[PDB]
Amino acid sequence: NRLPYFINYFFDTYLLINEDTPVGSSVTQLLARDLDNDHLVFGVVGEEASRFFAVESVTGVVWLRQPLDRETKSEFTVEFSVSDSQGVIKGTVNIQVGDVNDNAPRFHNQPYSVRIAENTPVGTPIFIVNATDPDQGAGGSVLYSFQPPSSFFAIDSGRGIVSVIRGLDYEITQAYQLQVNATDQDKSKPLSTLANLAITITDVQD
Ligand SMILES: [Ca+2]
Ligand SMILES: [Ca+2]
Ligand SMILES: [Ca+2]
Ligand SMILES: [Ca+2]
Ligand SMILES: [Ca+2]
Ligand SMILES: [Ca+2]
Ligand SMILES: [Ca+2]
Ligand SMILES: [Cl-]
């Protein structure tokens, strides 16, 4: 009696599952060959595997039980089983959760407040802002801008540096309530968030 064996590509390489996959969704179908043409029955082995993947006994279709996330867990290995009526064969399948852009940039220590004198020289960096993004590639890289734009302050798109660009005057304007806007470079469906930045201006002699 000749034992059964798997054939699918994802026993040598890896199986990709995009993290947006609704639960109850089929992820693949396990395919095996018995040389003696036995009606094979498939299963899922382990408890790590079994709380993620349910396997249709006969068809070898594999579907998703608990939802996926790459922010939590990027990759993990799972072991599947196929029966010969007398003997179980199992094989190691490296899963890899495929990323999507489901995280808008997240600020740290907002709101923001700065205090500078009217005489602050033009080009003086006065604050630095930081927004993180955990996503993959352009989903997880940030670009800072003002919103609306400002005439008196700029912000470095790369490093999030708030510099002075037009000279200030206390007798004209004693405060400036700006909104820093952080955005990710995912060209198809991008995300963006806002932080308040309240620059108070201090009087001097003129
Ligand atoms: Ca056999
Ligand atoms: Ca996610
Ligand atoms: Ca993601
Ligand atoms: Ca993102
Ligand atoms: Ca990042
Ligand atoms: Ca003045
Ligand atoms: Ca003054
Ligand atoms: Cl805020």
Side-chain angles (χ1 to χ4, degrees):
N1 195 62
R2 303 291 189 80
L3 276 164
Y5 71 107
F6 288 108
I7 45 155
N8 303 77
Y9 64 89
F10 53 61
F11 287 89
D12 294 322
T13 85
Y14 61 93
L15 168 57
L16 177 72
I17 322 194
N18 266 43
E19 72 184 16
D20 62 320
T21 316
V23 293
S25 292
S26 56
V27 293
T28 43
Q29 180 167 12
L30 293 167
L31 305 176
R33 262 163 191 160
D34 200 62
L35 291 86
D36 296 29
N37 294 41
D38 289 68
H39 164 274
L40 296 178
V41 64
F42 305 97
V44 59
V45 140
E47 295 311 323
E48 182 50 32
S50 299
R51 268 167 24 247
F52 270 127
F53 299 126
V55 173
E56 161 100 59
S57 44
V58 293
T59 84
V61 161
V62 183
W63 56 277
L64 199 72
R65 171 179 270 93
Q66 285 287 319
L68 266 169
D69 191 26
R70 194 195 50 80
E71 279 67 49
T72 306
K73 183 139 60 158
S74 55
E75 51 150 324
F76 61 110
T77 65
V78 161
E79 226 178 48
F80 289 116
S81 70
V82 67
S83 279
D84 201 9
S85 314
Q86 206 49 38
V88 148
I89 303 304
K90 60 198 73 167
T92 76
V93 170
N94 191 38
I95 306 285
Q96 285 212 321
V97 183
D99 187 61
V100 316
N101 190 41
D102 50 335
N103 293 239
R106 157 62 167 174
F107 278 119
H108 294 278
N109 309 127
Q110 75 289 346
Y112 300 125
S113 303
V114 190
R115 202 172 167 90
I116 75 187
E118 38 172 336
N119 57 32
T120 300
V122 169
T124 312
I126 55 157
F127 206 72
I128 187 96
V129 157
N130 177 64
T132 63
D133 211 299
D135 285 310
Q136 194 59 61
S141 73
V142 197
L143 249 61
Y144 310 88
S145 53
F146 275 136
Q147 198 214 71
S150 191
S151 62
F152 292 99
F153 308 101
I155 192 168
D156 184 313
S157 75
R159 304 212 293 280
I161 299 163
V162 186
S163 90
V164 172
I165 56 162
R166 278 177 27 66
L168 308 166
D169 186 75
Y170 174 95
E171 287 84 21
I172 287 162
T173 315
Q174 314 75 29
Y176 290 85
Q177 302 177 256
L178 318 192
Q179 299 196 308
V180 178
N181 184 77
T183 162
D184 47 18
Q185 259 57 238
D186 190 41
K187 56 177 183 59
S188 55
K189 192 257 166 166
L191 292 164
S192 82
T193 39
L194 284 186
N196 281 116
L197 172 61
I199 303 159
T200 311
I201 304 293
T202 56
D203 201 13
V204 303
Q205 307 229 350
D206 316 294

PDB file of all heavy atoms in Angstrom, residues 1-5 33-40 84:
ATOM      1  N   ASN A   1       0.869  -1.233   0.000  1.00  0.00           N
ATOM      2  CA  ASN A   1       0.000   0.000   0.000  1.00  0.00           C
ATOM      3  C   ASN A   1       0.893   1.267   0.000  1.00  0.00           C
ATOM      4  O   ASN A   1       1.674   1.447   0.968  1.00  0.00           O
ATOM      5  CB  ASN A   1      -0.979   0.003   1.182  1.00  0.00           C
ATOM      6  CG  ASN A   1      -2.099   1.013   1.017  1.00  0.00           C
ATOM      7  OD1 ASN A   1      -2.892   0.918   0.080  1.00  0.00           O
ATOM      8  ND2 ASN A   1      -2.175   1.983   1.918  1.00  0.00           N
ATOM      9  N   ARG A   2       0.758   2.107  -1.044  1.00  0.00           N
ATOM     10  CA  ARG A   2       1.571   3.338  -1.278  1.00  0.00           C
ATOM     11  C   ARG A   2       0.917   4.529  -0.571  1.00  0.00           C
ATOM     12  O   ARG A   2      -0.314   4.722  -0.757  1.00  0.00           O
ATOM     13  CB  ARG A   2       1.680   3.624  -2.779  1.00  0.00           C
ATOM     14  CG  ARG A   2       2.281   2.489  -3.600  1.00  0.00           C
ATOM     15  CD  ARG A   2       3.756   2.294  -3.293  1.00  0.00           C
ATOM     16  NE  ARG A   2       4.422   1.360  -4.206  1.00  0.00           N
ATOM     17  CZ  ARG A   2       4.856   1.657  -5.448  1.00  0.00           C
ATOM     18  NH1 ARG A   2       4.687   2.875  -5.952  1.00  0.00           N
ATOM     19  NH2 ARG A   2       5.451   0.722  -6.177  1.00  0.00           N
ATOM     20  N   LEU A   3       1.708   5.314   0.184  1.00  0.00           N
ATOM     21  CA  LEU A   3       1.214   6.468   1.010  1.00  0.00           C
ATOM     22  C   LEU A   3       0.837   7.648   0.103  1.00  0.00           C
ATOM     23  O   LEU A   3       1.298   7.734  -1.048  1.00  0.00           O
ATOM     24  CB  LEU A   3       2.293   6.881   2.027  1.00  0.00           C
ATOM     25  CG  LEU A   3       2.312   6.084   3.332  1.00  0.00           C
ATOM     26  CD1 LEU A   3       3.624   6.306   4.078  1.00  0.00           C
ATOM     27  CD2 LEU A   3       1.110   6.443   4.221  1.00  0.00           C
ATOM     28  N   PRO A   4      -0.015   8.597   0.598  1.00  0.00           N
ATOM     29  CA  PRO A   4      -0.366   9.794  -0.153  1.00  0.00           C
ATOM     30  C   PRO A   4       0.656  10.903   0.084  1.00  0.00           C
ATOM     31  O   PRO A   4       1.359  10.827   1.026  1.00  0.00           O
ATOM     32  CB  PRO A   4      -1.737  10.166   0.419  1.00  0.00           C
ATOM     33  CG  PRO A   4      -1.648   9.736   1.883  1.00  0.00           C
ATOM     34  CD  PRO A   4      -0.675   8.559   1.905  1.00  0.00           C
ATOM     35  N   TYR A   5       0.695  11.887  -0.794  1.00  0.00           N
ATOM     36  CA  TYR A   5       1.633  13.024  -0.736  1.00  0.00           C
ATOM     37  C   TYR A   5       0.939  14.274  -1.300  1.00  0.00           C
ATOM     38  O   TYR A   5       0.158  14.149  -2.256  1.00  0.00           O
ATOM     39  CB  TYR A   5       2.940  12.659  -1.460  1.00  0.00           C
ATOM     40  CG  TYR A   5       2.855  12.563  -2.969  1.00  0.00           C
ATOM     41  CD1 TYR A   5       3.413  13.545  -3.783  1.00  0.00           C
ATOM     42  CD2 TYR A   5       2.246  11.483  -3.590  1.00  0.00           C
ATOM     43  CE1 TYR A   5       3.352  13.464  -5.175  1.00  0.00           C
ATOM     44  CE2 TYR A   5       2.168  11.388  -4.982  1.00  0.00           C
ATOM     45  CZ  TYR A   5       2.724  12.383  -5.780  1.00  0.00           C
ATOM     46  OH  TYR A   5       2.657  12.307  -7.152  1.00  0.00           O
ATOM     47  N   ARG A  33      -1.943  13.430  -3.975  1.00  0.00           N
ATOM     48  CA  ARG A  33      -1.984  12.239  -4.843  1.00  0.00           C
ATOM     49  C   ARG A  33      -1.694  10.995  -4.002  1.00  0.00           C
ATOM     50  O   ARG A  33      -0.646  10.964  -3.357  1.00  0.00           O
ATOM     51  CB  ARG A  33      -0.947  12.364  -5.962  1.00  0.00           C
ATOM     52  CG  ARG A  33      -1.507  12.859  -7.277  1.00  0.00           C
ATOM     53  CD  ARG A  33      -0.412  13.335  -8.189  1.00  0.00           C
ATOM     54  NE  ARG A  33      -0.957  14.042  -9.338  1.00  0.00           N
ATOM     55  CZ  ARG A  33      -0.272  14.901 -10.111  1.00  0.00           C
ATOM     56  NH1 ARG A  33       1.010  15.174  -9.864  1.00  0.00           N
ATOM     57  NH2 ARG A  33      -0.882  15.489 -11.127  1.00  0.00           N
ATOM     58  N   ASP A  34      -2.604  10.022  -4.006  1.00  0.00           N
ATOM     59  CA  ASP A  34      -2.337   8.626  -3.581  1.00  0.00           C
ATOM     60  C   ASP A  34      -2.115   7.805  -4.850  1.00  0.00           C
ATOM     61  O   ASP A  34      -2.985   7.865  -5.749  1.00  0.00           O
ATOM     62  CB  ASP A  34      -3.477   8.065  -2.721  1.00  0.00           C
ATOM     63  CG  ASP A  34      -3.075   6.862  -1.874  1.00  0.00           C
ATOM     64  OD1 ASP A  34      -2.194   7.018  -1.007  1.00  0.00           O
ATOM     65  OD2 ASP A  34      -3.632   5.789  -2.094  1.00  0.00           O
ATOM     66  N   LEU A  35      -0.996   7.086  -4.933  1.00  0.00           N
ATOM     67  CA  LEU A  35      -0.636   6.256  -6.113  1.00  0.00           C
ATOM     68  C   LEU A  35      -1.701   5.160  -6.297  1.00  0.00           C
ATOM     69  O   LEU A  35      -1.887   4.722  -7.442  1.00  0.00           O
ATOM     70  CB  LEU A  35       0.766   5.649  -5.921  1.00  0.00           C
ATOM     71  CG  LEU A  35       1.943   6.645  -5.974  1.00  0.00           C
ATOM     72  CD1 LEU A  35       2.207   7.281  -4.600  1.00  0.00           C
ATOM     73  CD2 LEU A  35       3.213   5.972  -6.489  1.00  0.00           C
ATOM     74  N   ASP A  36      -2.385   4.759  -5.200  1.00  0.00           N
ATOM     75  CA  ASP A  36      -3.394   3.660  -5.167  1.00  0.00           C
ATOM     76  C   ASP A  36      -4.837   4.230  -5.257  1.00  0.00           C
ATOM     77  O   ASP A  36      -5.776   3.456  -5.003  1.00  0.00           O
ATOM     78  CB  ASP A  36      -3.211   2.790  -3.912  1.00  0.00           C
ATOM     79  CG  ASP A  36      -1.876   2.031  -3.851  1.00  0.00           C
ATOM     80  OD1 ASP A  36      -0.878   2.531  -4.420  1.00  0.00           O
ATOM     81  OD2 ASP A  36      -1.853   0.940  -3.240  1.00  0.00           O
ATOM     82  N   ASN A  37      -4.993   5.528  -5.602  1.00  0.00           N
ATOM     83  CA  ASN A  37      -6.301   6.212  -5.916  1.00  0.00           C
ATOM     84  C   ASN A  37      -7.298   6.113  -4.728  1.00  0.00           C
ATOM     85  O   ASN A  37      -8.529   6.128  -4.997  1.00  0.00           O
ATOM     86  CB  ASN A  37      -6.951   5.651  -7.192  1.00  0.00           C
ATOM     87  CG  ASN A  37      -6.159   5.943  -8.450  1.00  0.00           C
ATOM     88  OD1 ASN A  37      -4.935   5.849  -8.457  1.00  0.00           O
ATOM     89  ND2 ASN A  37      -6.852   6.289  -9.524  1.00  0.00           N
ATOM     90  N   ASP A  38      -6.801   6.039  -3.476  1.00  0.00           N
ATOM     91  CA  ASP A  38      -7.636   6.014  -2.235  1.00  0.00           C
ATOM     92  C   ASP A  38      -8.375   7.339  -2.109  1.00  0.00           C
ATOM     93  O   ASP A  38      -7.740   8.362  -2.338  1.00  0.00           O
ATOM     94  CB  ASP A  38      -6.789   5.830  -0.970  1.00  0.00           C
ATOM     95  CG  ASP A  38      -6.172   4.456  -0.799  1.00  0.00           C
ATOM     96  OD1 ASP A  38      -5.276   4.116  -1.590  1.00  0.00           O
ATOM     97  OD2 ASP A  38      -6.588   3.742   0.143  1.00  0.00           O
ATOM     98  N   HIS A  39      -9.666   7.317  -1.745  1.00  0.00           N
ATOM     99  CA  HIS A  39     -10.447   8.529  -1.354  1.00  0.00           C
ATOM    100  C   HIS A  39      -9.775   9.157  -0.125  1.00  0.00           C
ATOM    101  O   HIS A  39      -9.954   8.621   0.978  1.00  0.00           O
ATOM    102  CB  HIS A  39     -11.934   8.196  -1.098  1.00  0.00           C
ATOM    103  CG  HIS A  39     -12.674   9.268  -0.348  1.00  0.00           C
ATOM    104  ND1 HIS A  39     -12.677   9.342   1.053  1.00  0.00           N
ATOM    105  CD2 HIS A  39     -13.425  10.308  -0.778  1.00  0.00           C
ATOM    106  CE1 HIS A  39     -13.395  10.375   1.436  1.00  0.00           C
ATOM    107  NE2 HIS A  39     -13.867  10.985   0.337  1.00  0.00           N
ATOM    108  N   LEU A  40      -9.013  10.234  -0.328  1.00  0.00           N
ATOM    109  CA  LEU A  40      -8.238  10.930   0.730  1.00  0.00           C
ATOM    110  C   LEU A  40      -9.172  11.767   1.570  1.00  0.00           C
ATOM    111  O   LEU A  40     -10.190  12.270   1.018  1.00  0.00           O
ATOM    112  CB  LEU A  40      -7.176  11.819   0.083  1.00  0.00           C
ATOM    113  CG  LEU A  40      -6.098  11.092  -0.709  1.00  0.00           C
ATOM    114  CD1 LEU A  40      -5.138  12.083  -1.349  1.00  0.00           C
ATOM    115  CD2 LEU A  40      -5.340  10.114   0.174  1.00  0.00           C
ATOM    116  N   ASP A  84      -4.802   8.152   4.421  1.00  0.00           N
ATOM    117  CA  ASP A  84      -4.771   7.057   3.427  1.00  0.00           C
ATOM    118  C   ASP A  84      -5.725   5.944   3.873  1.00  0.00           C
ATOM    119  O   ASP A  84      -5.630   4.847   3.311  1.00  0.00           O
ATOM    120  CB  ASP A  84      -3.342   6.510   3.294  1.00  0.00           C
ATOM    121  CG  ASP A  84      -3.046   5.765   1.997  1.00  0.00           C
ATOM    122  OD1 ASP A  84      -3.894   5.795   1.089  1.00  0.00           O
ATOM    123  OD2 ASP A  84      -1.962   5.164   1.908  1.00  0.00           O
TER     124      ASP A  84
END
